[PDB]
Design a protein around this nucleic acid. Sequence first.
RNA 1: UGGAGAGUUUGAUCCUGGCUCAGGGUGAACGCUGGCGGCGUGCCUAAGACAUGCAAGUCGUGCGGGCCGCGGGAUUUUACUCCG
Length: 150
Amino acid sequence: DFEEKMILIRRTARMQAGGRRFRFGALVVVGDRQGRVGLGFGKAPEVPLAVQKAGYYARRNMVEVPLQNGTIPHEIEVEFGASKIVLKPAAPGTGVIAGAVPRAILELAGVTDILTKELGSRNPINIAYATMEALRQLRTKADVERLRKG
RNA sequence: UGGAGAGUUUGAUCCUGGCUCAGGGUGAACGCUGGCGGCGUGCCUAAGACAUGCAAGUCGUGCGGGCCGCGGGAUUUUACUCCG
Ligand SMILES: NC[C@@H]1O[C@H](O[C@H]2[C@@H](O)[C@H](O[C@@H]3[C@@H](O)[C@H](N)C[C@H](N)[C@H]3O[C@H]3O[C@H](CO)[C@@H](O)[C@H](O)[C@H]3N)O[C@@H]2CO)[C@H](N)[C@@H](O)[C@@H]1O
Ligand SMILES: [Mg+2]
Ligand SMILES: [Mg+2]
Ligand SMILES: [Mg+2]
Ligand SMILES: [Mg+2]
Ligand SMILES: [Mg+2]
Ligand SMILES: [Mg+2]
């Protein structure tokens, strides 16, 4: 079992004859702090059920994060829709310098030392999806070598 | 060895997009408050106007004097005059 941080919860609303009718969404990261994180987005008529639903979804949605001493192999920019995330390696003693959303994700993947910047649409959902892709897309000297053989 | 973002357009959503804030800085000023020291710093305006004192002189080993004194001489008549 992993840690489960909740980034964003919000109440949405649909219209119906005589009144508005509310739903709830919840963004949840789950991770072990050792190279596995999962992002999950879950909606439901009550907050509780939505958070729970989200964690579940988050576990069905995990990722290889190739740490290298609390940080990442290289720099990556990822655009997701209009949201862009940059992710930069840092020596130790730096911290995770990042906004609320990518930080929670980087924390639970066991990144300890990383420089970020949100560019673009600063939309939480979309920033989180970009952060995931960004991690998702990390390679290392190892796998790159392996890719380039013949 | 270096990079955090948030609030606000909607019933709700995404995007655009402005506005606003959190940070650092100061020859400061204003309020409330005020114990000590060290080191810095102090007319941003009228390059307005200025009382009063002080702020560039020194050299007699370049030169000749004036003025106020004192001493010694040429003089034993008291006027004149040489030197220091
Ligand atoms: N007298 C007060 C004001 O002086 C002003 O003039 C001032 C300026 O001309 C000059 O002041 C200077 C200033 O220009 C420049 N920025 C340097 C420094 N800041 C000031 O310094 C001046 O005043 C300070 C004390 O205040 C003195 O210690 C300094 O030695 C003197 N030069 O000298 C005057 C003061 O010395 C205005 N004339 C007027 O508003 C009024 O005279
Ligand atoms: Mg784009
Ligand atoms: Mg924008
Ligand atoms: Mg409108
Ligand atoms: Mg509204
Ligand atoms: Mg904005
Ligand atoms: Mg002083």
